[PDB]
Amino acid sequence: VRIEKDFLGEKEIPKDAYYGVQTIRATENFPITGYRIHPELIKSLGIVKKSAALANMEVGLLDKEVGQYIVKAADEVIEGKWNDQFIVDPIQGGAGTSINMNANEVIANRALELMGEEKGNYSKISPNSHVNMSQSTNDAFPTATHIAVLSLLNQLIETTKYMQQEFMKKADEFAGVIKMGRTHLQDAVPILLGQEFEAYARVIARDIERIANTRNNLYDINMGATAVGTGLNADPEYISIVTEHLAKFSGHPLRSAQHLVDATQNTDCYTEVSSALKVCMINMSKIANDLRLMASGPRAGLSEIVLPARQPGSSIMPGKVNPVMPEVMNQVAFQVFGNDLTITSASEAGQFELNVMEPVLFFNLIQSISIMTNVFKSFTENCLKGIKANEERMKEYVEKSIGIITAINPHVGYETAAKLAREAYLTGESIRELCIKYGVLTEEQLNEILNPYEMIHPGIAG
Amino acid sequence: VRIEKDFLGEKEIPKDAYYGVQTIRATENFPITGYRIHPELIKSLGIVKKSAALANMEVGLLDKEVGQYIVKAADEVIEGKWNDQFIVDPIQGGAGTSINMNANEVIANRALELMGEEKGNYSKISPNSHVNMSQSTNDAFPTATHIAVLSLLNQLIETTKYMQQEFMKKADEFAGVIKMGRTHLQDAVPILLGQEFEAYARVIARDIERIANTRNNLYDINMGATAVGTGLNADPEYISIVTEHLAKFSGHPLRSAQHLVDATQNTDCYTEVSSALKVCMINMSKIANDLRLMASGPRAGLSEIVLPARQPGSSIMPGKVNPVMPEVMNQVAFQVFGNDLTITSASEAGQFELNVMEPVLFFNLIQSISIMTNVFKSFTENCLKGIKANEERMKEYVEKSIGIITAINPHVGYETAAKLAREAYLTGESIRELCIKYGVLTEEQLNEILNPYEMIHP
Amino acid sequence: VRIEKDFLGEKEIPKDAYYGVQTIRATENFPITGYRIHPELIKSLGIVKKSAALANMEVGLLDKEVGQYIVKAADEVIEGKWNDQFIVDPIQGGAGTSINMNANEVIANRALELMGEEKGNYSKISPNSHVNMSQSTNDAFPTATHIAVLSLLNQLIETTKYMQQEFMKKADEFAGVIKMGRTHLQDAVPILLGQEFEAYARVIARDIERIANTRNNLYDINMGATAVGTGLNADPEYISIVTEHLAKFSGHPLRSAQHLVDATQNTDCYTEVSSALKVCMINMSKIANDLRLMASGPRAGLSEIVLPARQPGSSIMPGKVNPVMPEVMNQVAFQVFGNDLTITSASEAGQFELNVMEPVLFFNLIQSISIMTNVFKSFTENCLKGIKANEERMKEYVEKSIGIITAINPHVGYETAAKLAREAYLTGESIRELCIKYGVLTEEQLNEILNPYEMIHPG
Amino acid sequence: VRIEKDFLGEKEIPKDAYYGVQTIRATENFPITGYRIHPELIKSLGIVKKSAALANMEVGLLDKEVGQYIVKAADEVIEGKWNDQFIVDPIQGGAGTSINMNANEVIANRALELMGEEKGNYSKISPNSHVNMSQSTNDAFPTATHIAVLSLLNQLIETTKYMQQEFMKKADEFAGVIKMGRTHLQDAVPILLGQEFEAYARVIARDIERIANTRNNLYDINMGATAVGTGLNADPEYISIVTEHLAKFSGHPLRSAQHLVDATQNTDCYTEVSSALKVCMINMSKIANDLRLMASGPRAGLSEIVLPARQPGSSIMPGKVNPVMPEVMNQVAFQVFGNDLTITSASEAGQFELNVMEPVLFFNLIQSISIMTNVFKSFTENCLKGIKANEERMKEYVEKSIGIITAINPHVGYETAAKLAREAYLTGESIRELCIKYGVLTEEQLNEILNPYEMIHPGIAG
Ligand SMILES: N[C@@H](CC(=O)O)C(=O)O
Ligand SMILES: [Ca+2]
Ligand SMILES: [Ca+2]
């Protein structure tokens, strides 16, 4: 063990620990969810602390001898070698101070270990004085979050792109598959299954566009703002140097916000992302709702498509296969919706120079990106690639519908077309049967008029 | 045209009008929605103003000669005679102050007209000094709201009880109608259409209970609170008497809240009501969603039930009958959900002694109650009562299903039961026909195992 | 008092009414809010019908003698001459069918009267056969809504730009007004009032940017899609013409969507507009919360700014000036939040080829735009432009604060700073006086260090 | 390593693991959040499994040799020996089948071990045939949830009660502490600080009542419903016995639902709970907001109250004391708001005989209860108990206010009071001074009129 003194007393800390009293105190204050910060935030925090230490040495404010061990220690953090050391709740008071301090202590303590000194020897390397030099909670924390969110978003985009491409392949596969379109859930007129799947592919391409556009406002960073955005006693050179580093290491084209009070007190950039992610899930949920309807059956549903069986569906009926993959998509949607409200509430709660509610906001926005990425990947691997169409059954729906009379009409004139439809609806005979029965059209004439393609695309009938 | 002057200058009030300059300024400040306060709120404002006058006269604060006409004028407001004079926007700043003054001005000017004086002569009858005597915005305004919400709630309750009884009628009507149950939208085991409709009746019964129970907290009013809850300078007798009058004239069992500061600054009683409304609409929405699935077709859908046609259809497209009635239920549900968020955000916005965000809160609360009352009524009279079942289509689903097999499962044993299940998926044939030819159970045993009452009860 | 027979029986339509039984039926079916659709939507419906009449005539589908009057009648609808005649509820089932038919019936009957026949003679001019020719509910309705939203949106942008400029004018006005920054509602370091205001103007600048970019997806219309987006029996030339007519008479650069089925069944374009509106109101509500705090008092509060009085206050309680304008701002913000959830649930509700929940979504979308426009306008003219500062008050928050030691810190070393702050917090003595007390800095140097600009900019 | 089997194929499974093929499949299908279901749900599933086994033996449906061991294995789940073994994501497709099978497999495998048989040997103890006998996912899963929710709800109520009473103590401690009331954030008339705190106590007490009242509907369980609520094949003796065991081991007054179809397909009882949780956090958030304002300062805020410091401040900023405890309450409030929307959305998506969105729902409902319990406890312990009043500073606010003229008014007549009020406002002088300077009341007369109690309570002037 080891001891450290705080304004609240002393704490017995395990020797193997790299956190200190501040982190433990945050543990006592906020035992809220029992979760830890997402590893991408940890890696981002490492980047910030590596960038600050580096920039600080260059302008001679941090001693070159101790700064090198801070850098080396930050790199290990960036590698994810110290994730277990980050113990503070993502839902916490103090506006991210504990998260920042958690990084500061773990970085100072590894830096100390690497130069043969002892953990807790803060007179030599200080979590506050060296590791946190030139920076405030209110710049280090948000900056880390922009990096983390950006990195996570790029991922989402790649995975959403792959899913959208796979939606496009099914449209090609189903390009010629004819079915009944439905409106109000009531039979309408012929549609192609491939047109429904292209419709899914296009809304997603659009989702990809909106999500990507939200990265721009995240690129503006507030490093060098000090407490309130005024940059009081900040060195303009530290600023331009630390941003240049942060951009390189993170691999994002970060820019230093033009007005740092603006970048320090406003949280619109975050609500922008959530909104785009919400719109996306809305569309995904709807698509998932269609897939579950098309897979309904096997006998008292619609049975248009077959989903790859992904686990036994019933614990007392060995047979039936539920659409579990689309089901989990729906549940992620409802999650993202709920997260969006929490983010909306947190953003509006900002006061004067700081929004103290960012911890809960950042936990929800990170959660949404991650869980969307996750279901997206899983759903495309385990469902979307293997979806198969029941072409024969969907064809039978077409031959038996009243809707085909819409393609037949212009060839037969309005009066008789309506009498054929009325007769077919009431007797349960197909329109074809009646057209041939009353000698109104031939078997050959109807075969050309009921062409799957001409029925589902514009064009003058004659 | 007449002249009233203001700390912002002169405004001309049309001679036909009973509002004064204060109300006009409200208009210019808050031209937000173009809507006007609910007629039930107007009545309630009247009740509040009449109860107040009567108390102030009894306790000798209001001159008996002027108060007599104030009461008379307030009574006309209660009676709906002056609805068009209430012109301020339900979405407004000033924490309802404009609403209060709108009632005050109208009642002042009508009282003056009644005693042969000139409208606008606030020397003789003042909107603040008389009509608002012993009152604050912060008691009169929430008190009328409590009264109005309560009255609207009781009307919702009666409408919902009626609707619930019409569901339970349909449950009895479909008591013996067998159909295939669906979980995950995947065929399960048989169920009775009447059983689903009982499920509906029962969930609604629970909604009625939840809704009615939210009334109790509204019965506590803050009349007499003055600005914050302290009641500075108020007569304890004025408080005692005005509460009595408020209950008598409103027909609600109102109670003077036990801690006036609590009643003046907290707004939990409205969120409690909105929550119960929201829960009800969730259930309603789910039910409407089902209704629309059951009516889907007539060839490429489930076609289990028929809903009365409420659209003119198409003469080219017979059989297409859109479920417009459940559709409107869904959209009301979606509004209520939204209304509830607005109510929540407005409630959390309270600060110290007053929650000034009440004007938007109340407008949304009132909207919710009102719009559910209206769909509940229209849905009931134009859809629910007339729903018919397609018995053959449904019976046909049972006979041609695999699910039928868990019902004749320990009559043949598990031996040739998986032979009867792994072949019934293969051949695409019914299980009734695979029992009369194999010989494991003959016609007479299949006759009662597949009874519309046998396989749907433990 | 005319008579019209419905598949449900005879209804008596008033002498001077231009609607018909179909509209009346919607009235019976859906007496939900007692509201009417927005006039811009009425105007946009008229544009849809006028464009359709012109295309149908050119393409040879509509008789030109009859069509000539349909156009005339539609123009009157556009000029807003028949807003009274649009009586259906914006919360309605049937996926906008009755809104469409309300337009169809009004235009038919007014066309009839223009050509001197009796209203209701739908053998001559049919709401269905003529006024709704080559159209479905499922393309005419959305296209009207797209045009209506876009017009309203352009007003909102114009209004928001104005408000944003007035914020920027206030930032320049206050550019030299020193005050104490607060984080966690706790005294922090000094900040200019002008800087806070610049932060309001820039967030609104971004809101405008966001809101404006949402117009693009709305430009893609589905006119010609017919029932499901297949365009079954549709003449491509009709589709092509009607689109170009819609762009011209609406003022928007409308384009025929690339995939009509997609355009017919997806609703992402509306939630996109909603989301951007919601984000704007979050920022506006936050700003109004600050204004209300800044104006608190006048004795037991922050009392940093004076808002123009807008509510009459009592002679007996002067000083009490309630910030009603930011208050209304806050409530429109709350309104928009809930509208946005309604919009989300409506959109998620879509099934297969059509989302039937659009009326409640469109009602909500239009409300949001409409109430934002009106509250921005009133707030700008009745609060923002007339804001004043209490310079002296804020100036002495700074002088009397501990926070100011941050500006002094690197000039006197960290250790002396902490000794000075400690005495400051103990005795109440100003940090300025303490430095002179101990001769650690001269009056000269305090004037250079505690300079308003010097404390609030990098260095 | 080991090899297992189900209706879809084979999987490899670690030898030390107690879960099986069906669980491991779910981990592949739903790698969504990386969270695990709540301890209390694991406990409750054990109660379901133990009760059903006991009921199956007494009916002569389950072999007593094998059944004896299932019970013993189930008790160890109840004691929490095997939590590490429940690995399925709380956000999952299949409507809880995975959570149900996770328990079924863990219990079967441990039951085998106990009787000296091999793990995975389902020929001897089947997770489907033995452990899940007579029950479905669609009763076992929601029944374990009702029980779990009830036990967490009882704990919350208890903690909330404790909090409320601490607020009541504060109200008493501050009963005579005079301050200025504010409406619109503008100065109004005097109020007692304790009158405010009492108003906080009373809204919480109503919250307790609401939350507690949501329990009634959760007492009705659907055990014996099989797949759809029809109790197909299920034996009336079993239902009666199992219902009786569930109540005894759960400690709750559980009842068999009157209409099992209703209880199987309806979800109102969960949204009812969520709603009560939301209303509460609305109130809690407001109180927190008032607290953070009251704590504002120390020189440019309101400085009405002092919160126990829970955060080390720098020696450069003494007196800056961030209200970290109320801040976390606010963020928990926003979390709960979001969770309620997720819950509304999931409950709405029910279809026919089952709502398959229960997993995301249940996860958010358990999250809301738990995180409220946790902040409530921490907040009272690390903030509420230690709040002190700035009596002096608040008295000064009262004396320098304009609103005291409302008390003085009746003793003076309207017009003299008005004049004094206006002159006090414009000159910045105290109403008290102007009263003497002009001789409208004496020093002693004013001390009578400005009595802290008589100003903040109803009563005629004289
Ligand atoms: N959730 C399954 C039942 C089960 O797994 O026991 C179904 O309803 O299909
Ligand atoms: Ca029938
Ligand atoms: Ca000035």
Short mmCIF file of N, CA and C in Angstrom, two decimals, chain B residues 46 104 129-130 142 158 181 216 238 245 263 331 353 365 385-386 389 404 427 438-439 452:
data_model
loop_
_atom_site.label_atom_id
_atom_site.label_comp_id
_atom_site.label_asym_id
_atom_site.label_seq_id
_atom_site.Cartn_x
_atom_site.Cartn_y
_atom_site.Cartn_z
N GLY B 46 -63.21 32.84 -14.62
CA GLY B 46 -64.41 33.47 -14.13
C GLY B 46 -64.74 33.02 -12.72
N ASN B 104 -59.23 40.06 -15.56
CA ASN B 104 -59.47 41.24 -14.74
C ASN B 104 -60.08 42.42 -15.52
N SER B 129 -57.11 46.80 -8.46
CA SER B 129 -57.55 47.15 -7.11
C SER B 129 -58.78 46.38 -6.65
N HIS B 130 -59.69 46.09 -7.58
CA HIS B 130 -60.93 45.40 -7.24
C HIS B 130 -60.98 43.96 -7.73
N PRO B 142 -52.63 29.78 -11.44
CA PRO B 142 -52.64 28.31 -11.26
C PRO B 142 -53.97 27.75 -10.73
N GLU B 158 -64.97 10.07 -18.61
CA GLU B 158 -66.26 9.54 -19.05
C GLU B 158 -66.15 9.01 -20.47
N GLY B 181 -52.20 -16.81 -33.04
CA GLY B 181 -51.42 -15.83 -32.30
C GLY B 181 -50.06 -15.60 -32.94
N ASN B 216 -56.24 13.73 -7.55
CA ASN B 216 -56.17 14.05 -6.12
C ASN B 216 -55.17 15.17 -5.82
N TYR B 238 -60.39 35.36 4.55
CA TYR B 238 -60.48 35.42 3.10
C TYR B 238 -60.06 34.09 2.46
N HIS B 245 -65.76 28.68 -1.55
CA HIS B 245 -66.43 29.16 -2.76
C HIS B 245 -65.89 28.51 -4.04
N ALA B 263 -47.07 24.68 -2.68
CA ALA B 263 -48.07 24.73 -3.75
C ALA B 263 -47.79 25.80 -4.81
N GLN B 331 -51.45 9.38 -34.51
CA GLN B 331 -50.94 10.73 -34.58
C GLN B 331 -51.23 11.53 -33.31
N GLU B 353 -39.26 30.67 -6.23
CA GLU B 353 -40.64 30.73 -5.75
C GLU B 353 -41.69 30.58 -6.86
N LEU B 365 -50.74 20.67 -21.65
CA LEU B 365 -51.49 19.78 -20.80
C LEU B 365 -52.90 19.75 -21.33
N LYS B 385 -67.13 0.49 -32.72
CA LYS B 385 -68.43 -0.14 -32.61
C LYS B 385 -68.78 -1.03 -33.79
N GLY B 386 -68.21 -0.72 -34.96
CA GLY B 386 -68.60 -1.37 -36.20
C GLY B 386 -67.66 -2.45 -36.71
N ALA B 389 -65.46 -9.25 -37.96
CA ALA B 389 -64.41 -10.24 -38.08
C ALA B 389 -64.57 -11.07 -39.35
N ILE B 404 -50.65 -25.46 -34.50
CA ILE B 404 -51.70 -26.40 -34.11
C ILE B 404 -51.14 -27.68 -33.46
N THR B 427 -44.43 -31.28 -46.69
CA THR B 427 -45.53 -31.48 -47.64
C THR B 427 -46.36 -30.22 -47.93
N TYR B 438 -52.65 -41.47 -40.91
CA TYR B 438 -51.63 -42.17 -40.11
C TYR B 438 -52.27 -43.11 -39.08
N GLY B 439 -53.32 -42.63 -38.41
CA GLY B 439 -54.12 -43.45 -37.49
C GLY B 439 -53.81 -43.31 -36.01
N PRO B 452 -62.13 -24.38 -30.32
CA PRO B 452 -61.84 -22.96 -30.08
C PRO B 452 -61.83 -22.54 -28.61
#
